[PDB]
Write an enzyme that holds these catalytic residues in place. Sequence first.
Site, PDB file in Angstrom:
ATOM      1  N   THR A 157      60.439  -3.387  38.462  1.00 24.75           N
ATOM      2  CA  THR A 157      60.220  -4.335  37.449  1.00 24.75           C
ATOM      3  C   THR A 157      59.761  -5.877  37.926  1.00 24.75           C
ATOM      4  O   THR A 157      60.807  -6.199  39.123  1.00 24.75           O
ATOM      5  CB  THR A 157      60.952  -4.361  36.305  1.00 24.75           C
ATOM      6  OG1 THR A 157      60.788  -3.181  35.814  1.00 24.75           O
ATOM      7  CG2 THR A 157      60.695  -5.507  35.258  1.00 24.75           C
TER       8      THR A 157
HETATM    9  C1  LIG Z   1      61.456  -1.887  38.015  1.00 25.43           C
HETATM   10  C2  LIG Z   1      60.634  -0.848  38.233  1.00 25.43           C
HETATM   11  C3  LIG Z   1      62.637  -1.958  38.721  1.00 25.43           C
HETATM   12  O1  LIG Z   1      63.633  -2.916  38.514  1.00 25.43           O
HETATM   13  C4  LIG Z   1      61.947  -2.083  36.496  1.00 25.43           C
HETATM   14  O2  LIG Z   1      63.043  -2.636  36.184  1.00 25.43           O
HETATM   15  C5  LIG Z   1      61.751  -0.862  35.716  1.00 25.43           C
HETATM   16  C6  LIG Z   1      62.348  -1.258  34.295  1.00 25.43           C
HETATM   17  C7  LIG Z   1      61.407  -0.936  33.189  1.00 25.43           C
HETATM   18  C8  LIG Z   1      60.881   0.513  32.892  1.00 25.43           C
HETATM   19  C9  LIG Z   1      62.406  -1.069  31.701  1.00 25.43           C
HETATM   20  N1  LIG Z   1      62.688   0.239  36.005  1.00 25.43           N
HETATM   21  C10 LIG Z   1      62.291   1.379  36.161  1.00 25.43           C
HETATM   22  O3  LIG Z   1      61.042   1.886  36.109  1.00 25.43           O
HETATM   23  C11 LIG Z   1      63.590   2.372  36.561  1.00 25.43           C
HETATM   24  C12 LIG Z   1      63.846   2.217  37.668  1.00 25.43           C
HETATM   25  C13 LIG Z   1      65.107   2.604  37.974  1.00 25.43           C
HETATM   26  C14 LIG Z   1      65.582   3.754  38.756  1.00 25.43           C
HETATM   27  C15 LIG Z   1      66.592   4.302  38.768  1.00 25.43           C
HETATM   28  C16 LIG Z   1      67.798   3.663  38.147  1.00 25.43           C
HETATM   29  C17 LIG Z   1      67.392   2.384  37.622  1.00 25.43           C
HETATM   30  C18 LIG Z   1      66.100   1.919  37.628  1.00 25.43           C
HETATM   31  N2  LIG Z   1      63.093   3.771  36.122  1.00 25.43           N
HETATM   32  C19 LIG Z   1      63.856   4.556  35.369  1.00 25.43           C
HETATM   33  O4  LIG Z   1      64.838   4.193  34.484  1.00 25.43           O
HETATM   34  C20 LIG Z   1      63.286   6.009  35.372  1.00 25.43           C
HETATM   35  C21 LIG Z   1      62.535   6.076  33.934  1.00 25.43           C
HETATM   36  C22 LIG Z   1      61.970   7.506  33.685  1.00 25.43           C
HETATM   37  C23 LIG Z   1      61.312   8.205  34.939  1.00 25.43           C
HETATM   38  C24 LIG Z   1      61.133   7.719  32.449  1.00 25.43           C
HETATM   39  N3  LIG Z   1      64.268   7.008  35.495  1.00 25.43           N
HETATM   40  C25 LIG Z   1      64.743   7.245  36.491  1.00 25.43           C
HETATM   41  O5  LIG Z   1      64.331   7.247  37.634  1.00 25.43           O
HETATM   42  C26 LIG Z   1      66.057   8.309  36.439  1.00 25.43           C
HETATM   43  C27 LIG Z   1      67.061   7.256  36.029  1.00 25.43           C
HETATM   44  C28 LIG Z   1      68.464   8.030  36.112  1.00 25.43           C
HETATM   45  C29 LIG Z   1      69.350   6.834  36.471  1.00 25.43           C
HETATM   46  C30 LIG Z   1      69.951   7.155  37.737  1.00 25.43           C
HETATM   47  C31 LIG Z   1      71.055   5.608  37.642  1.00 25.43           C
HETATM   48  C32 LIG Z   1      71.444   5.255  36.772  1.00 25.43           C
HETATM   49  C33 LIG Z   1      70.568   5.241  35.340  1.00 25.43           C
HETATM   50  C34 LIG Z   1      69.706   6.053  35.409  1.00 25.43           C
HETATM   51  N4  LIG Z   1      66.197   8.959  37.656  1.00 25.43           N
HETATM   52  C35 LIG Z   1      65.746  10.107  37.989  1.00 25.43           C
HETATM   53  O6  LIG Z   1      64.913  10.885  37.112  1.00 25.43           O
HETATM   54  C36 LIG Z   1      65.953  10.302  39.323  1.00 25.43           C
HETATM   55  N5  LIG Z   1      64.905  11.154  40.035  1.00 25.43           N
HETATM   56  C37 LIG Z   1      64.921  12.631  40.323  1.00 25.43           C
HETATM   57  C38 LIG Z   1      63.940  12.990  41.268  1.00 25.43           C
HETATM   58  O7  LIG Z   1      64.041  12.326  42.371  1.00 25.43           O
HETATM   59  C39 LIG Z   1      63.415  10.881  42.110  1.00 25.43           C
HETATM   60  C40 LIG Z   1      64.574  10.316  41.159  1.00 25.43           C
END
Ligand SMILES: *[C@@](C)(CO)[C@](*)(O)[C@H](CC(C)C)NC(=O)[C@H](Cc1ccccc1)NC(=O)[C@H](CC(C)C)NC(=O)[C@H](CCc1ccccc1)NC(=O)CN1CCOCC1
Lengths: 195, 195, 204, 222, 222, 125, 212, 196, 233
Positions: H1
Amino acid sequence: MDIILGIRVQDSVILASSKAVTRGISVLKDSDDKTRQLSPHTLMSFAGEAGDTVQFAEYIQANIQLYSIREDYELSPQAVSSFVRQELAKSIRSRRPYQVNVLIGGYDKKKNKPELYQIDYLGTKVELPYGAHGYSGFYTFSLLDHHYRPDMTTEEGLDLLKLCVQELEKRMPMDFKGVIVKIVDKDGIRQVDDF
Amino acid sequence: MDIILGIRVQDSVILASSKAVTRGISVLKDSDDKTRQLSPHTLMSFAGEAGDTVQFAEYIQANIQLYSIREDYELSPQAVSSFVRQELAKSIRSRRPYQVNVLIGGYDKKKNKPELYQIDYLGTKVELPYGAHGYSGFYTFSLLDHHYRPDMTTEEGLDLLKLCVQELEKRMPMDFKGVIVKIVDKDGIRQVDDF
Amino acid sequence: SDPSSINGGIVVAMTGKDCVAIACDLRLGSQSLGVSNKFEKIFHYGHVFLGITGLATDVTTLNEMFRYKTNLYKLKEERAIEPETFTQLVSSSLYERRFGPYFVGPVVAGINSKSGKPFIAGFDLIGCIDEAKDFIVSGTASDQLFGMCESLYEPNLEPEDLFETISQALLNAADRDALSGWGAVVYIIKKDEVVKRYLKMRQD
Amino acid sequence: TTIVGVKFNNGVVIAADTRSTQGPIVADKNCAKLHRISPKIWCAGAGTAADTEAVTQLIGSNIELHSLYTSREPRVVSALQMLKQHLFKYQGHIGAYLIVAGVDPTGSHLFSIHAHGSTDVGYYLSLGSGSLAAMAVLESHWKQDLTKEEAIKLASDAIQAGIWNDLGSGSNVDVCVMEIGKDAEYLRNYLTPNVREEKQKSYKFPRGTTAVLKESIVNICD
Amino acid sequence: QFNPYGDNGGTILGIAGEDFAVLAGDTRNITDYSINSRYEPKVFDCGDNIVMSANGFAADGDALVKRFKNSVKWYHFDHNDKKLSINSAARNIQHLLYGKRFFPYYVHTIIAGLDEDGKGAVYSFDPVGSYEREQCRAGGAAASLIMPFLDNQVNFKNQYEPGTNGKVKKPLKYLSVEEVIKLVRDSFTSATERHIQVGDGLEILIVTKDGVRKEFYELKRD
Amino acid sequence: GYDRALSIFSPDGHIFQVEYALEAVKRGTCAVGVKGKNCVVLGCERRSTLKLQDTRITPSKVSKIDSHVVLSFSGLNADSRILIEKARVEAQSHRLTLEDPVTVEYLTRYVAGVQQRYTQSGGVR
Amino acid sequence: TTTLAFRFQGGIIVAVDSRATAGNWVASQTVKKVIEINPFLLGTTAGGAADCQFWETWLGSQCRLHELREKERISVAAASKILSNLVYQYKGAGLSMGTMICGYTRKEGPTIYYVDSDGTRLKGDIFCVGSGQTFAYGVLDSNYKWDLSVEDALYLGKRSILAAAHRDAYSGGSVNLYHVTEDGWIYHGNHDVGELFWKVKEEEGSFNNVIG
Amino acid sequence: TSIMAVTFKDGVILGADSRTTTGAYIANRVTDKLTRVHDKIWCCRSGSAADTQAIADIVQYHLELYTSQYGTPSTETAASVFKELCYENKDNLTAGIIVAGYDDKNKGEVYTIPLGGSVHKLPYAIAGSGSTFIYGYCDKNFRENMSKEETVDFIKHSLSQAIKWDGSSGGVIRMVVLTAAGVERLIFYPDEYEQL
Amino acid sequence: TQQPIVTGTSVISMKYDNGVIIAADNLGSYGSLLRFNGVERLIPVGDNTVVGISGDISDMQHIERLLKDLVTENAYDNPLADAEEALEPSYIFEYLATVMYQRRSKMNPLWNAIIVAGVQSNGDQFLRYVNLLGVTYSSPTLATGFGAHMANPLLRKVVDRESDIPKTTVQVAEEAIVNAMRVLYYRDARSSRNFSLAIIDKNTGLTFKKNLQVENMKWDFAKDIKGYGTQKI
Ligand SMILES: *[C@@](C)(CO)[C@](*)(O)[C@H](CC(C)C)NC(=O)[C@H](Cc1ccccc1)NC(=O)[C@H](CC(C)C)NC(=O)[C@H](CCc1ccccc1)NC(=O)CN1CCOCC1
Ligand SMILES: *[C@@](C)(CO)[C@](*)(O)[C@H](CC(C)C)NC(=O)[C@H](Cc1ccccc1)NC(=O)[C@H](CC(C)C)NC(=O)[C@H](CCc1ccccc1)NC(=O)CN1CCOCC1
Ligand SMILES: *[C@@](C)(CO)[C@](*)(O)[C@H](CC(C)C)NC(=O)[C@H](Cc1ccccc1)NC(=O)[C@H](CC(C)C)NC(=O)[C@H](CCc1ccccc1)NC(=O)CN1CCOCC1
Ligand SMILES: [Cl-]
Ligand SMILES: [Mg+2]
Ligand SMILES: [Mg+2]
Ligand SMILES: [Mg+2]
Ligand SMILES: [Mg+2]
């Protein structure tokens, strides 16, 4: 490989070595002789890692026999024990060390004295009146501290040795299938067949 | 704890259990009875983790004795074995499971038949003509496959059992200090003093 | 230390023309050690048949549990439970232990007494229902069973022909798995008769 | 799995393949991944198979009780809220990846939910192992103001991309159309482009091939 | 940390007749859940009426085939254009494989051809060089599915003579090239149905005294 | 390393260095071997231009290779020690690997092989 | 694997199973676990398949070179020691070999040597090697006597493998029998457990644990 | 983000990109990271999508219940509720939230709440992975009491650079304007902002 | 043992009736940082081959030098260096494939995925893949990284098998490639808008296009999307 004992008395050295060769949950053999004659008046018993023990024992045997032929002369037990110690002292800093502990029982013909040396795989040599390797020592040393006398005969030494084997057979967890006993004196090396 | 065997013959169940209790490099005891009488015609031998074994055996014993008093009636070997299995089946998903393997030898007075059940610490129950726990089975099962017959007498069963103990004493690494043998039949439970 | 492959064993179920078949091996072992050659893995509650592979303690526990639940069902409902209903009961009960599951591979088989339709189903350890027209497989030789069934099977087999197909599927699969075999049992199920046959197989 | 959702003129359509895997083995060649939460709210599920079925049934049960309590037809946002809060509470351990869609008094809706409880809004969505293959098609062919027949075509094409290109997906294409003012139509096996060819040989054995030891009649009656 | 191995999937199958031998293999090449190629041959004519396939990690498989083909070439140079017999090829391949005992070729190798009496021969190898001549062998991802079927249909295992009380076994006999190809095709269609890494196409190499013939068949592409 | 080919052929097909080595043997003190029905006897000459010798410590002409085999020689005394040492080592090596002492033929074959190697190796005579 | 060989009045019996496994997957039921080094020498194979087969075929080449050089058949001791010294060089590298070198010579008589991949070399009268060695020991030891006839000894060796083939999950397929005499080794056939078990059960009256 | 909030003369403006990622895959290219917790109190979400949504939903519930009893809450009050959730559950949350709101008394206010759950009241705030690349730019270019058009340009240029350098940021630039006039949503597409 | 530092993303390619097309964006990523924007990842060898490389850029530059040196070495004592004994795509590929597998075998790989696209002397289309593991394969469409997941599905709709190749024109083929590059810009977080595209035709020869941009993008629908579920403003 597990139990090897040694007792130096007035006129001889007595080595006792267990007969069991165990692997996993199977006693593969119950009549194994864990010793090699290095020279007519020098005997080495051994215990430790599988393969390493015999390989090391025969290597030492070959070297001592080579010396005997070259010089037409028998090395003293002290000389042999020092040679063995150095080989183990080299080994411990090798890529793959010999994991072998030995007892060297010999009769010095020049001094007319029996000699017992205990050497571990690190190359740690000590001359002793009685010795042991592995968990055996934890029982036999205290027992010998009590019953041993320096002026004992070969027959008294064998009775003293029977007392050790009995204690080990009573308190040791593993079945080591008895011991082969050998005597080293002025007349050379001989095996006690009924023990 | 190590060796527990069981053999069901024509008119009785015979349980054999090793006498050694070891801890470390010391055999602390060589006359240990690894069994509890659950009822006049039901006997349970046990082996496994130190402490757990006796604690579990006596707990079961207490529960079965309580039942006997309450109903003025002896539970069948099948009923007891099912009760025991369930207790172990609960245990395996507890915070700290009972690591105990058992054999339940009993004589069903209603059916006039001997019964031998083998139950492991997971709660795995099987009715068998002959059973064993631990490394013992790796020798005794094949031996019994060959020599066992279903119509054997108690005396034939004891000779068959002697054949197992001899094999174990020959090929097992550890010294288990012989076995206590008990017979379960229509007249109840009795111990063979000379084995 | 993999619960699903400590004891070993297999179950297979097939449909035919107005009939179903369910079969299992008889081995119970502790890893390499074969312990019992009488350990049957197929049970039945009324006309509904349940086969269970996996950890043997859980196989026994679940049999006792489903006997418990089907007995109460029958007392309250005043009728025998049907395969479709029993399948849901198995799924419910397994998913109840979602985060501490029974290490099993159950297989339901039977004929609906009202409609007369042959029914089979399979489950994973946490209760996911796998319904099938043709066949369901389970156990340590599931790969082998999948291969045998997918090639040998054909629809609308008569009870006598279906017996040969399911038996050959089980036998040849079991002979390629170390932890399966040591005897086998085959149930042939018709609308109002059930035949149980013990197979002769190699004992190694 | 491959699952998709596509919004159109007067409603929404979802679709799914019908492969169920167990490692590299195909366990079910024709499983149903489209789930009914309420009559006009349907759910496509990917991930842990038991979890998607369990979570959709639980919320579907509670949605029914809620609909009876409030004397109203259920809303998609209610199913969305109840699913995400349930999934969030379990911190991703319940491995359900859902595409939630439907029609209600508020209108037509399309959402996705992930195992950790995050929701997304969109006109076209795709989840599962073949989501990238599907999304490639959706990104290439989607446009604003799709008709019913155009959306079904786009949705099924997106699933087909998964079927052919993703090893995790295969077999058939299920579809459910939810149009405003009409009953939702569940199109089970809408496409069946993976029919097994005739076998070269019949493996029907001669009767008596199998060696038998014992026979016995089993008693099923009381 | 760098992992020098990979899994390219696929499966292979060798059957030996009386005066012929076949070596079949699917043409699909994969990594993880992606398809790399729908037609990438892994069954090769190596000369001297020897066909070979090394299924598993394709890079190691290609390396091995390449080295054996080269071994055949140098065998001619060093021994007056003598024909390399199938048994001599097998032993040579053992030394190729065992030469890398402590950094193995991650492959299941199968070779097929005719022995020095003109009879069909199939040899199979483990990754480090253990080999055995057999009538029948499947290798690769779907070996566990196909092999028990082959035991039953090629070697007639668990099949007894009807009405003989399971006392007389079904007698062993050689199969015709027509019957063998039927079993190969049915084996691969079955494997394609239940294994995700198997599909796209089937390529069979048939070896007779006349030479090496090829046949190709379509498989399901999902 | 010193590489020179010292032992080489001559126009008439002779290796002079090997033949001149035979002249050194011809210069050496006489040695004789006679084998009986149940024994072998090795006789050796010792030149008597050397008085004031200490026969206790002076290297003996007959050497034990093992407890069952002996080696005597004629020619350069210093050269003989090298062959004897190699032979003694090989005798112990044979016992170690074959678990049996050398035959007399084997020990001879080894010693002869060593002598041959020095006739077509670079840098050695 | 289950392999055994024992010494007795009439020479040496050698018996092996024929199964090969990759985990729980039964990879083969027809493996040859006795390797014919020469008309007077046999070697058994347990453990890693490639390791045993490769190094025991190699052993045969070394034994052939011995008799060319020495104009005499190699001793059983010398043959076994070539193999044990070889594996000892590879100690720690991860070779997995449990073998038995069995044979007859004039000087030694009938001789058996156990040799394994961690360098252990043992002369003895009875050995059982493999995952099902304990099952074979149970039957073999309880029925063994030095004064067994050639007929009875052959059966005991066969029956011992059968016992292990039955109980040990990683043993089976078929039994290969050999008899080693002063005149050399003699092959006594391949015996499929599929038919041998039921034949033994019926005739002997044993295996009462199994549903008949 | 990439997210930011900037106070100015008439109130405050929130800004954000629209990218959501799973590893290097873009799960959503049109995400709305600017979310309403009250009529004129909004927040920018960064970190875990699940966590920030769960949090925002709870805060919205709390402020709705606050309004029913005590009337309109202050922006400070809203930030306090965010803090309370982020601080007390710091071990289980990955949420970087910027709270922005418009009072009539206090005008535009911006509170930022990093991972730890600390609260920081600032004239403007930047956060998210892409914010690292614009600390230099934003510090040099920010001025207090800017106009609406100036603040929109400041946010647009800033997030344009953040998006350009950060792989985890992209898509459209969303903005939400909070003033006495009301609430205005703005959107800016790649073709415009990329060539700034 | 390595870890890649500065990296290049997808390389996509396909066959058409008279030749092959290959494309790759001009980005050099440093983790999440989109560090370098003027990176050319398509490298022509002669007038009949283009090598597209993804993965570690330092190793890519090493491979550039090897190919450059290969052209020099081939010209030595070769009067037909610009004719019959010119470098073929198959020669160039096999050389790289040999190196890649030798390096993986020494546990020190070139951390790349490579696609060698070109046209042989007899007019046949050449398109083959090789990577850090030494794994090689050929197909009517080939792609690396995210391209394998997103581009291949789209390109296979045009050329699904061998028989579809003669039916596919250069106009249709390029249109599909350019479309795929747009999809990758939508969905790959380590991709850029700017890219290069190369066409090797058996008639018109090598056409190398630089400084292309993704265009005709759909973003307008974003304005309608609000909140993540219940939000209406
Ligand atoms: C930017 C991108 C980074 O700071 C922004 O902050 C955005 C915020 C918006 C969307 C509010 N963040 C994200 O897009 C965020 C990045 C992220 C990833 C992991 C941990 C924290 C932040 N993405 C997500 O939250 C996605 C959204 C889904 C795909 C709709 N979720 C994941 O990637 C999940 C998160 C699980 C998790 C892990 C640790 C702590 C909290 C949650 N992870 C996965 O699905 C793992 N995935 C499996 C396949 O291999 C790739 C990883
Ligand atoms: C595509 C196919 C995958 O991307 C889809 O997403 C589908 C979704 C549909 C079916 C709802 N997913 C699957 O098919 C799914 C893939 C999968 C596998 C493993 C973990 C997560 C997802 N498959 C399953 O869920 C199967 C369903 C069976 C075939 C009916 N279940 C299993 O494979 C279970 C997994 C159970 C599980 C427990 C705890 C956490 C997560 C999952 N595994 C087994 O049964 C394996 N094993 C057999 C031996 O006994 C022990 C268990
Ligand atoms: C009994 C049967 C118990 O093992 C015997 O001891 C036999 C002895 C006979 C075969 C001489 N031993 C085995 O069957 C032996 C068991 C074993 C397995 C692995 C390591 C040590 C011992 N099996 C093998 O050696 C098999 C023989 C094959 C089936 C022909 N080989 C393998 O398992 C190979 C190679 C193992 C290996 C050794 C050293 C380095 C690398 C590999 N492994 C595979 O094929 C792996 N796998 C098979 C399943 O499909 C995917 C690949
Ligand atoms: Cl979000
Ligand atoms: Mg089996
Ligand atoms: Mg077995
Ligand atoms: Mg397939
Ligand atoms: Mg960006």
